[PDB]
Amino acid sequence: MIGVLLMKSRANEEYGLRLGSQIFVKEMTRTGLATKDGNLHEGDIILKINGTVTENMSLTDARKLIEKSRGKLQLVVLRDSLE
């Protein structure tokens, strides 16, 4: 937990930093199918969900996809397995 303050030393353009966002496992129901098997850990970055991209996608969309996904849902993760 450490923040960094970066200052600008060029009046030509912005910092030139492109920040993106990905959908991760914020939280799951206790004693559920996700916790019983341990498919994804709280905080793990998801790459794809039910054949749908999980990068730059809207939070509302990701939540809607899981809601509309009545039956079986697929989740893909990038790196990190056991640890």
Next chain:
Amino acid sequence: MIGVLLMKSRANEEYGLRLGSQIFVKEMTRTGLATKDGNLHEGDIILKINGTVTENMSLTDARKLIEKSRGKLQLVVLRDSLE
């Protein structure tokens, strides 16, 4: 790389999994102020930006914050406190 397929239980209900999004460093200009100091790692998860939360926030908002913050910008990273 590694994906998991979760199925529904024998009962009319949802999975109960809450998926959230976080703003990370997608890509930055080489030989810049961010790379010179190494404030954030490409792909690293950010906790806050210029005092603005970096969880569940919007991609446009995060980009606007950095753009509107002409001069100096603050960033928060999570990966253990180290000097």
